[PDB]
Amino acid sequence: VQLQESGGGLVQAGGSLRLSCAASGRTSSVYNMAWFRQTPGKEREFVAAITGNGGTTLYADSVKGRLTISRGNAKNTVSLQMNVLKPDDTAVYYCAAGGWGKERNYAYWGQGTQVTVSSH
Ligand SMILES: [Cl-]
Ligand SMILES: [Cl-]
């Protein structure tokens, strides 16, 4: 199983981005999926997660009411709607799958997509 991300980029503060992630390869399960983020010299930190059936979500406090995680239509797809972005949201964002909770013990990881939020 491999994970591919899209939707990153450079955006002005107050703007919005929608990150997307999709599993490729034969998956034998519907997985829980998550997003983490990493700034230079620091660790990947939890942002949000959603269970396989879409019924349960978990969010870091710093993004509550601004970021919303959801499942996509295809099997093992997830989106992260990022609104009201701030410069501190600048990071590489990683999709993960196969796990639960806020630690980095998820079985599958994407290779990251850069988000940069700039004042304008
Ligand atoms: Cl890490
Ligand atoms: Cl899972």
Short mmCIF file of C-alpha atoms and ligand atoms in Angstrom, two decimals:
data_model
loop_
_atom_site.label_atom_id
_atom_site.label_comp_id
_atom_site.label_asym_id
_atom_site.label_seq_id
_atom_site.Cartn_x
_atom_site.Cartn_y
_atom_site.Cartn_z
CA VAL A 1 0.00 0.00 0.00
CA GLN A 2 1.25 3.47 -0.96
CA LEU A 3 -0.27 6.89 -0.26
CA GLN A 4 -0.23 9.83 -2.67
CA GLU A 5 -1.01 13.41 -1.61
CA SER A 6 -2.08 16.48 -3.54
CA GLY A 7 -3.50 19.98 -3.02
CA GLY A 8 -0.63 21.73 -1.30
CA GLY A 9 0.86 24.98 -2.33
CA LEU A 10 1.48 28.61 -1.45
CA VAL A 11 -1.51 30.59 -0.21
CA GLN A 12 -2.17 33.87 1.50
CA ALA A 13 -3.03 34.08 5.18
CA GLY A 14 -6.78 33.81 5.63
CA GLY A 15 -6.97 31.62 2.53
CA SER A 16 -7.93 27.98 2.18
CA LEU A 17 -6.49 24.79 0.73
CA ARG A 18 -7.88 21.27 0.37
CA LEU A 19 -5.36 18.45 0.74
CA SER A 20 -6.24 15.08 -0.74
CA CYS A 21 -4.74 11.64 -0.24
CA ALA A 22 -5.44 8.33 -1.96
CA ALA A 23 -4.09 4.86 -1.41
CA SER A 24 -2.71 2.94 -4.36
CA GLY A 25 -2.02 -0.78 -4.61
CA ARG A 26 -4.29 -3.60 -3.53
CA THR A 27 -5.63 -2.79 -0.07
CA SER A 28 -7.21 -5.60 1.90
CA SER A 29 -9.07 -3.29 4.30
CA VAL A 30 -10.76 0.06 4.59
CA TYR A 31 -8.25 1.93 6.72
CA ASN A 32 -8.45 4.77 9.19
CA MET A 33 -6.60 7.70 7.64
CA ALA A 34 -4.81 10.66 9.14
CA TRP A 35 -2.81 13.79 8.47
CA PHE A 36 0.37 14.86 10.25
CA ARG A 37 2.57 17.89 9.69
CA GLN A 38 6.25 18.66 10.13
CA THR A 39 8.26 21.87 10.18
CA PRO A 40 12.04 21.94 9.68
CA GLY A 41 14.06 20.29 12.43
CA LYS A 42 10.94 19.12 14.30
CA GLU A 43 8.90 15.92 14.32
CA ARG A 44 5.78 14.90 12.40
CA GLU A 45 2.89 15.96 14.65
CA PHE A 46 -0.73 14.81 14.52
CA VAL A 47 -3.29 17.06 12.83
CA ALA A 48 -6.45 14.99 12.25
CA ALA A 49 -7.74 11.47 11.68
CA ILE A 50 -10.94 9.77 10.56
CA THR A 51 -12.04 6.16 10.94
CA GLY A 52 -12.61 3.82 8.02
CA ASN A 53 -16.40 4.23 8.10
CA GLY A 54 -16.20 8.00 8.46
CA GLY A 55 -18.08 7.91 11.76
CA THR A 56 -15.35 9.15 14.15
CA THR A 57 -12.82 11.96 13.88
CA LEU A 58 -9.95 13.11 16.06
CA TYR A 59 -8.33 16.56 15.83
CA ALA A 60 -5.38 18.33 17.36
CA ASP A 61 -6.61 21.28 19.43
CA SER A 62 -4.69 23.87 17.37
CA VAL A 63 -6.75 23.13 14.23
CA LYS A 64 -10.23 22.61 15.68
CA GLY A 65 -12.83 24.72 13.90
CA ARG A 66 -10.41 25.47 11.06
CA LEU A 67 -9.50 22.12 9.54
CA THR A 68 -12.02 19.41 8.68
CA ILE A 69 -11.13 15.84 7.71
CA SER A 70 -13.43 13.73 5.55
CA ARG A 71 -13.43 10.55 3.50
CA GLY A 72 -13.51 10.74 -0.26
CA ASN A 73 -15.72 8.71 -2.59
CA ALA A 74 -13.07 6.20 -3.56
CA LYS A 75 -11.84 3.50 -1.22
CA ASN A 76 -9.12 4.75 1.13
CA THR A 77 -9.25 8.40 0.15
CA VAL A 78 -9.26 11.29 2.61
CA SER A 79 -9.36 15.06 2.36
CA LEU A 80 -8.27 17.83 4.71
CA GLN A 81 -10.15 21.08 4.20
CA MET A 82 -7.92 23.80 5.63
CA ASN A 83 -9.62 27.11 6.23
CA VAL A 84 -8.63 30.37 7.90
CA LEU A 85 -5.00 29.53 7.30
CA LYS A 86 -2.25 31.23 9.34
CA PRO A 87 1.51 31.52 8.71
CA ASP A 88 2.08 28.97 11.52
CA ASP A 89 0.21 26.39 9.41
CA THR A 90 3.23 26.33 7.05
CA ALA A 91 4.63 22.78 7.10
CA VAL A 92 5.01 19.61 5.07
CA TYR A 93 1.73 17.67 5.46
CA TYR A 94 1.81 13.88 5.42
CA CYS A 95 -1.06 11.48 4.91
CA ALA A 96 -0.99 8.27 6.96
CA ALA A 97 -3.15 5.16 7.10
CA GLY A 98 -3.50 1.98 9.13
CA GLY A 99 -3.65 3.00 12.77
CA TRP A 100 -5.45 5.24 15.19
CA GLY A 101 -4.52 7.90 17.69
CA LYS A 102 -1.96 10.67 17.66
CA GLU A 103 1.33 8.76 17.68
CA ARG A 104 3.38 7.97 14.57
CA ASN A 105 2.56 4.22 14.70
CA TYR A 106 0.57 4.22 11.47
CA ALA A 107 1.46 1.50 8.96
CA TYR A 108 1.50 3.61 5.79
CA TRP A 109 2.80 7.13 5.08
CA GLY A 110 2.73 9.45 2.10
CA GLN A 111 5.84 11.34 1.11
CA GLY A 112 4.50 14.79 2.02
CA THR A 113 3.18 17.93 0.37
CA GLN A 114 4.38 21.43 1.27
CA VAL A 115 1.89 24.03 2.44
CA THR A 116 3.13 27.61 2.80
CA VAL A 117 0.93 30.36 4.23
CA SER A 118 2.24 33.89 3.71
CA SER A 119 1.00 37.28 4.75
CA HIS A 120 0.16 39.40 1.71
CL CL B 1 8.94 12.34 12.67
CL CL B 2 -6.82 1.20 10.20
#
